Structure 1
Amino acid sequence: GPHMATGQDRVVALVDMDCFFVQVEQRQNPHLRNKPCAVVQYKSWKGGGIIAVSYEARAFGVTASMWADDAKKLCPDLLLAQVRESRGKANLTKYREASVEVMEIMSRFAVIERASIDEAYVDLTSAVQERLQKLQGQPISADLLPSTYIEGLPQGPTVQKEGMRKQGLFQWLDSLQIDNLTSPDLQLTVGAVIVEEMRAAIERETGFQCSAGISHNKVLAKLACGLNKPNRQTLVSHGSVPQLFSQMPIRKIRSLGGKLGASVIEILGIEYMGELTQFTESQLQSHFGEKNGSWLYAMCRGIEHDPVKPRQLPKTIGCSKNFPGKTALATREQVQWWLLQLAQELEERLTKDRNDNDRVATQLVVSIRVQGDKRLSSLRRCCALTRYDAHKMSHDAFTVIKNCNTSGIQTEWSPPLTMLFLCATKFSAS
């Protein structure tokens, strides 16, 4: 009863940009705005691979992980913007720089955790307390939440979408007790007010729209964010969790979309997150391990304790290229030329990083794939990174992988390399 933790101690938001690389290209090129359009990398093989898709184009069935030639079959008028190519490879700098624009704006409101190139978690607990003291028991107007959905509402005793949103918001606000500064539901609501403000600032100052989730932890905030995309935000209360989870496939929860989640389904013979509540913590620990078991036991009740890490910058800076099929690297000179291309991009990004962020990488990771191997990576070796010099780094990379060459002739490389990867890691302040 009185001692049961309910995981309602924090207010956490997740802000995720809508169709992000497409918006970056639409800002740059007004001809692409309000169009079915997608961002593609490379072109020769099946028109290139789509990696981002506008919502207009999604209506035709266009997705990421789709070849452009196939997308054009679904949507003949699809517009395409190409990822930049530099030194023979795709170069994502424009999107990384647009990411920094958004992350720096979010950072004005609170400490953020960069979770990907286009999303960040926000711990709003302290900001919410401060907004609550200024409000002085004053009710929260629906006008302060113009793009907010309350998950699970309306319920109980119109046929248009915005109408339903307002109905749900009205029921939520009608029920609130603004008299209590420690009320979790009130805290979430104030969190949502702040996230409206954050999202408005992002759009005003960058031109980019985003969605967001507001809840009591990262997993629920992430889940909430996706419930109403694009250009909307969703509040998932603690109380909404039993109904939400009662029909929620396990794979939808972050970290359960792979083998672990499949094993939860198979071993326990269940389908939905809510069904996990019927197992003891020890039962779940027995199947999935101590850490996963405890995490699942709490998570299926809406409780999760992973902190929002104060980290706005990536911890690693990497450069990767595949050499598929016929294009696999089969000569020493090929291998060395591409290691140099990768190293030159890496040096460029590292030198910029040192100037911007007052740090230096100290370790170079070199990874390759070899033709035939099912695995992403066949081999990963580290060596010292002591100077930001591309020729040194590429020479060093060649040295750590040189003996992977089964070839009796040193000029040839066998089995041919289908991937090269250079990654700078282990930063120190500088």
Structure 2
Amino acid sequence: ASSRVIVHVDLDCFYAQVEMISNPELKDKPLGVQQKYLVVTCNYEARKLGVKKLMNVRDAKEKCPQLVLVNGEDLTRYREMSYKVTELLEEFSPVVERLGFDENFVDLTEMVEKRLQQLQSDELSAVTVSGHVYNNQSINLLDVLHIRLLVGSQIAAEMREAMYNQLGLTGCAGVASNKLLAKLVSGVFKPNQQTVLLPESCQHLIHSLNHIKEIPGIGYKTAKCLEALGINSVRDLQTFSPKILEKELGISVAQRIQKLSFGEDNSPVILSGPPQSFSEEDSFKKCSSEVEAKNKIEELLASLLNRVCQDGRKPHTVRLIIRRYSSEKHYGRESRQCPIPSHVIQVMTPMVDILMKLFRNMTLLSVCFCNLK
């Protein structure tokens, strides 16, 4: 083990794609999916007209006074489709990592080897790429690594083909030697296409970023910390002092994101498997009297119970989270965790009050069934 062939699959405007399959009349027409006062996602037709994801419904219609909107506050169908995609990819190779509802990582390393071993000392020269090659780099058919990434692009092509035939879904794929690069290159040719990255082009891809914040792994926070240090470009981070950085973010985060700035990411593809938790949420115009407004909570449990059930396993912990309006609390949530009565495990009534007492001990309300077994 040493050289991996990873693939990053990223579905195009996933929610719109599901809504469109539902009611076809929505195709070719600018379609935006709405949650409260936001247009979380939209089909490309609409993006052409200026609709950008996570855009105010207003800023959205006064940019495209024709945009069709559907409500996407209920993630049931999306979720269901998200697992259908993951499963299909699990077929090609079991080790699949989900990143949100629309992303998956697959370690194709073992699969590329098996395929290569079936090729004869001739046909191995007829190996061809499938899709784009980043920075239009030249392929060297004698470079074993090149042969491997190209095979990976074929498999990548196959998965994309299967997704569309079997599930009616289009999307992108990125093939590289680690998760960071694969995710970075999957977006190069945006609408429903695929790109493969050859080693020689790693820095080019890394340096094409305009801000460290663009590097998967570096969030909103870490970015601001780095700024406060005069670290703005990816090369600033590459050339910055190991000591100082290590001494201000933690030898961990430090040593890790600096490897990242170079295109280095040794993290494995974790097998996601079944969810580690189930939760429903609900935001509402500061509309909760601090009581009686727990009929909403009864609502959450309704669906959740239907979900936690279906799964098969049973959760051994419940939780409640809340919010409070006032100033601009850029981060403010509160939750009361608690074990679930063994008897009650094996129905609403009990639970209802269970959350109620958890309620009292304490704009948005959400229940979460975690600790599954």
How has the CA–CA distance of structure 1 residues 93 and 69 changed in structure 2, closer, same or farther, with 3 Å as cutoff?
Answer: same
Instruction: Report the Cα offset of residue 376 of structure 1.
Output: 4.5
Q: Is the 8 A contact 1:16 1:211 kept in 2?
A: yes
Alignment match, 1:106: 89
- Indicate the structure with greater strand content: 1
**What amino acid maps onto 2:160 in structure 1?**
R
2:217 to 255, 268, 275: 255
Separation in structure 2 between the aligned mates of residue 285 and residue 136 of structure 1, nearest angstrom: 49
- SS of the equivalent of 2:150 reads helix
1:81 aligns with 2:40: no
**What amino acid maps onto 2:301 in structure 1?**
A
Alignment match, 1:427: 372
Separation in structure 2 between the aligned mates of residue 245 and residue 348 of structure 1, nearest angstrom: 45
1:151 aligns with 2:134: yes
Percent of residue pairs bearing the same amino acid type:
31
Instruction: Report the Cα offset of residue 8 of structure 1.
Output: 6.2
1:319 to 272, 276, 280: 280
Alignment match, 2:35: 41
Alignment match, 1:385: 340
- SS of the equivalent of 2:61 reads helix
2:300 to 342, 351, 354: 342
Deviations 1:260-316 (A, max 9, x none): 02222331x232223322235434312321111211232122111111111133211
Alignment match, 1:119: 103
Q: Is the 8 A contact 1:8 1:216 kept in 2?
A: no
Moved more, 284-293 or 121-130: 284-293
Q: Is the 8 A contact 1:8 1:238 kept in 2?
A: no
Alignment of 1:180-219 (within 5 A): 183-219=144-180
- SS of the equivalent of 1:324 reads coil
Alignment of 1:27-426 (within 5 A): 27-42=21-36, 48-83=37-72, 90-110=73-93, 111-137=95-121, 138-142=124-128, 145=130, 148-153=131-136, 171-172=138-139, 175-177=140-142, 183-248=144-209, 249-267=211-229, 269-325=230-286, 327=287, 329-334=288-293, 336-354=294-312, 359-372=313-326, 374=329, 376-386=331-341, 387=344, 389-404=347-362, 418-426=363-371
> TM-score, normalised on structure 2?
0.91
> TM-score, normalised on structure 1?
0.80
- Structure 2 alignment gaps of length 5 or more: none
Q: Is the 8 A contact 2:218 2:257 kept in 1?
A: no
Moved more, 118-127 or 66-75: 66-75
How has the CA–CA distance of structure 1 residues 11 and 282 changed in structure 2, closer, same or farther, with 3 Å as cutoff?
Answer: farther
**What amino acid maps onto 1:130 in structure 2?**
K
- Structure 1 alignment gaps of length 5 or more: 1-6, 43-47, 84-89, 155-170, 405-417
Deviations 1:16-71 (A, max 9, x none): 111101011111111112232111135xxxxx421111111111110222233331
Separation in structure 2 between the aligned mates of residue 345 and residue 102 of structure 1, nearest angstrom: 23
Instruction: Report the Cα offset of residue 324 of structure 1.
Output: 2.5
Higher Cα Rg, which structure: 1
Separation in structure 2 between the aligned mates of residue 132 and residue 189 of structure 1, nearest angstrom: 11
Q: Is the 8 A contact 2:276 2:370 kept in 1?
A: yes
Q: Is the 8 A contact 2:203 2:262 kept in 1?
A: yes
Q: Is the 8 A contact 2:217 2:257 kept in 1?
A: no
Deviations 1:362-392 (A, max 9, x none): 1112111123271544311111124353332
Separation in structure 2 between the aligned mates of residue 375 and residue 264 of structure 1, nearest angstrom: 20
**What amino acid maps onto 1:53 in structure 2?**
C
**What amino acid maps onto 1:23 in structure 2?**
Q
Separation in structure 2 between the aligned mates of residue 392 and residue 376 of structure 1, nearest angstrom: 32
- SS of the equivalent of 2:265 reads coil
Separation in structure 1 between the aligned mates of residue 360 and residue 259 of structure 2, nearest angstrom: 48
Deviations 1:313-356 (A, max 9, x none): 3211011112233x2x115212x2111111111111111111xx
Computed over aligned residues only, the root mean square deviation of the Cα atoms, in angstroms, reads: 2.0
